[PDB]
């Protein structure tokens with residue numbers, strides 16, 4: 001019943017994530033080898049360090065991250081996860097570690113074009129399966145052709161190929177794609193967003209002892225501006 005003691009005993013903290021989402025988590029050539037990096041990984045490492053155990057990152061597609069936590073394949077899920085009311089019915093969440101807006105990534109040549117929701121309504125929109133940006137499009141733009149894709153990298157590949165006109169995603173991720181790729185930009189139009197709902201670490205219910213440790217680490221990061229600093233450092237890394 002003791003999450004903290006169980007983690008200490010096995011000597012590792014297992015964190016489920018989906019590394020398709022720079023600057024939160026993504027793949028980068030460190031040395032040498034492909035490695036999962038990003039602000040969420042630095043935070044997960046801080047939590048593991050506080051507990052005195054090794055960090056083990058378990059990579060999968062986003063739409064299976066919460067399920068893997070729920071069924072015991074990981075101790076925590078950290079994947080830029082919005083702490084929604086719906087999700088709070090099933091999981092407990094840490095205090096928020098970062099709060100951001102939600103944006104559309106488009107072609108630079110189309111920034112003047114997609115100025116309102118009516119214009120997006122007639123566009124081919126992509127979003128990630130099992131996500132808040134996906135739900136928002138379904139709710140607020142029901143008349144749009146929405147393509148739901150498992151992997152965010154594939155959504156962006158479809159945007160680059162011209163099969164998709166706009167991809168809905170967390171703003172820091174859109175900014176990163178725009179900053180690292182010539183033909184891309186963040187649209188000036190955005191959907192109405194669910195008040196509250198910041199990123200938080202997900203845990204199984206009745207994990208109060210582990211939640212306290214996670215909250216302590218997160219509060220210290222926010223107090224020192226460290227999570228912001230982690231995001232800025234991640235932005236200087238190249239993705240695979």
Ligand SMILES: NC(=[NH2+])NCCC[C@H](N)C(=O)O
Pocket residue numbers: 017018019020021024025062079080081082083128130131132133152170
């Ligand atoms: N690693 C990822 N692909 N994360 C996607 C997160 C999307 C959104 N913030 C959500 O919780 O639904």
